[PDB]
């Protein structure tokens, strides 16, 4: 074959997380499955900035710290679109036509990522500075 047959390759309980994440999933539209990614990566990214920052013990640490978290995401949706210009030159048609093989929804992935990538970010700033 091509791959190897261990006793734990292609095991069910890890495939249940694999084929149900919002990037390998079945029916989600590429505007929406980029939201669940952007809601995911955004909420924790304001973790490291607010307890490990240049100023941590001020008014002032969660507020400024969380500007850099949305300030990181805007460099990521940039890096998503430069991947869109360079991998999808016209979204050249390929073997699967996923969101990922052939593009077709990439700036709907990109715009979907930025919604939670600002939305989930300040939600933790709500949950950290208040509550």
């Amino acid at each position: 074959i091509g791959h190897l047959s261990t006793p734990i390759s292609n095991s069910s309980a890890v495939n249940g997380l694999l084929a149900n994440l919002p990037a390998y999933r079945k029916g989600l539209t590429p505007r929406l499955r980029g939201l669940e990614i952007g809601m995911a990566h955004g909420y924790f990214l304001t973790g490291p900035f607010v307890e490990l920052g240049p100023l941590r013990n001020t008014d002032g640490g969660i507020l400024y710290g969380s500007l850099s978290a949305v300030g990181l995401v805007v460099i990521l949706t940039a890096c998503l679109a430069l991947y869109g210009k360079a991998n999808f030159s016209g979204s050249s048609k390929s073997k699967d036509a996923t969101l990922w093989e052939s593009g077709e929804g990439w700036s709907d992935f990109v715009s979907g990522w930025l919604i939670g990538g600002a939305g989930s970010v300040g939600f933790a700033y709500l949950l950290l500075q208040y509550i």
Partner: protein, 69 residues
Amino acid sequence: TQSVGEAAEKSFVMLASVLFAGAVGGPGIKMKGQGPAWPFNAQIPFTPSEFLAVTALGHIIGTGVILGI
């Protein structure tokens, strides 16, 4: 806990423990899928019967870690 509460940072230890449980207690359940199903028939990739155990297992592991540190 430099940006949060002292009894607020236990909730990260307790809620990680539910995810620490079900990540390796979840694939150990042999007979899965036995009833009842979800309240609003939300087709979701586990059962409430199973998920109640993970929150129960997470509540025991989290008690072990919180009192352990």
